[PDB]
Amino acid sequence: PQITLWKRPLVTIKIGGQLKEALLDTGADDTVIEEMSLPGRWKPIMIGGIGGFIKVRQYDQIIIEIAGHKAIGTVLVGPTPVNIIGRNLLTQIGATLNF
Amino acid sequence: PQITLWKRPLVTIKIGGQLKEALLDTGADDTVIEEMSLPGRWKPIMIGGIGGFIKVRQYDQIIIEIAGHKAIGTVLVGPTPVNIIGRNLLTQIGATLNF
Ligand SMILES: CCCC[C@@H](CN[C@@H](CCCC)C(=O)N[C@@H](CCC(N)=O)C(=O)N[C@@H](CCCNC(N)=[NH2+])C(N)=O)NC(=O)[C@@H](NC(=O)[C@@H](NC(C)=O)[C@@H](C)O)[C@@H](C)CC
């Protein structure tokens, strides 16, 4: 669909078979989800944001549905202020910025 | 135009008489620009995201051209690692997310 930005671009996602709400984020390289139990092997890494760096668990090849669109890729799990869907998965669902 | 997300959606902007490169961030409520000596009155506020919060100066009615599109609104100035164009301005240039 076409989503305007007057409101935060929040969509429903399905991960680990669980429904969550996430923010479509063009300014995010990666996808970061709040702490949760996720079936899969992980590796600890650090990511950055506007205020500094935080440590997250890196899960690869995770099946996730975004607004009904399928994506299978890297999902970072950690203490993020909000669930965000980054470019790694936005490209998978064919999302583009238009103006 | 249409901007794909294979790489960071960076565009040229003009603010305070200077040209800079900024990130189109749909996951940002407001606009945060790198430290620059913008003239005029301002208000001290704090803004954040991943890693925490940072101190910035809030300027109102700032003229800013984004990728050739004129806009006018609130601009936060401070020690941000990246020039961030938020929704407050993305809506003004008619930007949408499409998939
Ligand atoms: C988590 C909060 C919501 C999403 C977030 C995404 N921001 C981009 C900004 C660009 C970097 C400064 C970001 O953090 N992107 C990260 C997301 C994490 C990730 N791993 O993708 C990123 O791409 N990080 C890269 C590196 C970015 C820096 N790059 C560089 N210096 N070359 C990384 N780690 O790979 N939004 C924000 O940070 C904005 N905050 C907000 O919109 C809200 N604040 C809060 C706390 O939620 C609102 C209430 O103010 C900031 C800019 C203030 C308006």
Side-chain angles (χ1 to χ4, degrees):
Chain A
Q2 173 165 260
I3 301 177
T4 55
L5 302 166
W6 301 100
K7 173 235 172 179
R8 289 176 179 178
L10 291 169
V11 298
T12 286
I13 65 167
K14 178 231 66 70
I15 180 176
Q18 183 179 59
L19 297 184
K20 292 183 171 293
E21 190 179 59
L23 179 62
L24 301 185
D25 192 358
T26 59
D29 294 339
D30 315 298
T31 293
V32 196
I33 305 301
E34 64 206 332
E35 230 304 284
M36 67 176 291
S37 305
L38 192 58
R41 180 83 186 183
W42 59 271
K43 174 186 187 62
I45 66 167
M46 282 178 67
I47 54 169
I50 197 183
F53 292 80
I54 67 170
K55 179 170 57 187
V56 297
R57 295 179 177 189
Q58 180 184 335
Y59 289 80
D60 293 328
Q61 304 183 327
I62 298 298
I63 302 176
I64 177 181
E65 205 154 288
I66 301 158
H69 288 74
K70 182 58 61 190
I72 307 179
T74 300
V75 174
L76 308 184
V77 178
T80 176
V82 63
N83 293 338
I84 57 178
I85 302 306
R87 293 188 298 100
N88 73 305
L89 302 180
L90 292 171
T91 49
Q92 290 206 17
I93 68 173
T96 56
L97 272 170
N98 299 264
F99 62 89
Chain B
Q2 172 173 112
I3 301 184
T4 59
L5 303 166
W6 299 110
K7 67 171 177 176
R8 293 174 174 147
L10 298 167
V11 296
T12 298
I13 60 159
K14 185 162 115 69
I15 177 181
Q18 293 191 309
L19 289 196
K20 300 177 173 187
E21 294 297 306
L23 183 73
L24 300 183
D25 193 357
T26 57
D29 283 2
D30 286 270
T31 296
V32 195
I33 301 302
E34 63 182 274
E35 174 57 47
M36 63 182 300
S37 304
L38 214 56
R41 212 68 203 76
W42 56 271
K43 183 181 193 177
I45 74 162
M46 277 175 70
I47 209 71
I50 288 173
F53 288 73
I54 62 169
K55 300 173 189 183
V56 294
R57 303 192 300 281
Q58 175 179 272
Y59 290 85
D60 297 330
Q61 295 293 87
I62 299 301
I63 300 170
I64 181 173
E65 195 180 72
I66 306 156
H69 288 65
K70 294 184 185 63
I72 177 176
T74 302
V75 178
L76 309 177
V77 181
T80 175
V82 184
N83 286 318
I84 298 152
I85 302 298
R87 293 187 299 102
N88 72 305
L89 295 181
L90 290 171
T91 53
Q92 295 190 31
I93 68 169
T96 54
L97 265 177
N98 303 71
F99 62 94

